[PDB]
From TrEMBL, chain A:
It comes from the Viruses. The chain holds residues 101 to 149 of 396 of the full protein. Mg(2+) 1 binds at residues 15, 46. Signal peptide: none annotated. This is HK97 gp5-like major capsid protein.
UniProtKB/TrEMBL annotation, chain B:
It comes from the Viruses. Mg(2+) 2 binds at residues 5, 19. This is HK97 gp5-like major capsid protein. Mg(2+) 3 binds at residues 6, 19, 35. Mg(2+) 4 binds at residue 15. The chain holds residues 150 to 198 of 396 of the full protein. It comes from Haloferax tailed virus 1.
């Protein structure tokens, strides 16, 4: 044209990349506060009642 | 080594004669013997043994 940024967009400069990556869907995480956490010694077990 | 022989009855001032050790060889060719075992991490942790 004459010298326009849509001509020289990859030759005279490089497009801005914003340094913050925007987070997607975050699920609500509550089980650890909202229940009793048993650190088990086996995968299969039983609890006496 | 060659089998053992007997020293020679010899005159006095007479030449000591040669019966030297003659040699041969036996080859070794060592074969690789291998055995493996695999265990899951869960199994390695849970075993009483
Ligand atoms: Mg059970
Ligand atoms: Mg002689
Ligand atoms: Mg001999």
């Amino acid at each position: 044209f004459a010298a326009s940024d849509p001509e020289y967009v990859d030759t005279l400069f490089r497009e801005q990349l914003l340094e913050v990556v925007m987070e997607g869907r975050e699920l609500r995480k509550v089980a650890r506060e909202a229940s009793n956490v048993i650190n088990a010694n086996t995968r299969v077990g039983d609890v006496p009642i | 080594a060659s089998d053992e022989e007997f020293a020679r009855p010899t005159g006095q001032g007479a030449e000591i004669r040669d019966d030297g050790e003659t040699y041969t060889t036996v080859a070794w060719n060592a074969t690789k013997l291998t055995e493996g075992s695999r265990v899951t991490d869960e199994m390695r942790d849970q075993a009483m043994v």
